[PDB]
Amino acid sequence: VLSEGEWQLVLHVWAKVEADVAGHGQDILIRLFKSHPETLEKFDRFKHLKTEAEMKASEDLKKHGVTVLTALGAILKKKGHHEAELKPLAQSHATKHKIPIKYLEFISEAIIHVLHSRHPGDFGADAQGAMNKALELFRKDIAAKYKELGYQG
């Protein structure tokens, strides 16, 4: 359970993200795909992209970055009371998109790295730990739904 002070840290940096949702979403997905290329293979939509320059030039990848960070922002702003928002995400990511929990750990690492690059004055260690906690709580609650459905592994 995050404290109120931890949530404030999380949402304070998240409000900085929302000034350039699309730039963040490109940086985060690029990082995820470069750092963990097995993740790119899950997107039939993006698996033709073979270089970082092609990734940065793809408008479709930019659009999907905004889809992802808009869904994450809506979950973070519920401060833990996010059951209605996770149900559908867990269900599609487990059963249709076939995404392992470990790949949610990987995109959490990329989100934390990109927030540290773009917002260092609002993303010191206190805020990095709080955002780590918020992304762990996201993964915990999605993993419990995966387990229900037979996909925790």
Instruction: Give whichever of 56 and 98 is closer to ligand HEM, judged by the CB atom.
Output: 98
81 is in an annotated binding site: no
Residues near ligand HEM (CB under 6 A), total: 16
Assess 55 for contact with ligand HEM (CB under 6 A): no
The residue number whose beta carbon is nearest to ligand HEM equals: 92
Instruction: Report, in Å, the least distance between residue 45 CB and ligand HEM.
Output: 4
At CB < 8 A and 24+ separation, what contacts does 8-15 make?
A: 9/126, 9/127, 9/130, 9/131, 10/76, 10/127, 10/130, 10/131, 10/134, 11/76, 11/77, 11/79, 12/122, 12/127, 13/115, 13/119, 13/122, 13/123, 13/127, 13/131, 14/73, 14/76, 14/77
12 is in an annotated binding site: no
- Residues of this chain that interact with ligand HEM (CB under 6 A) are 39, 42-43, 45, 67-68, 71-72, 89, 92-93, 97, 99, 103-104, 107
Residue set of the binding site for O2: 64
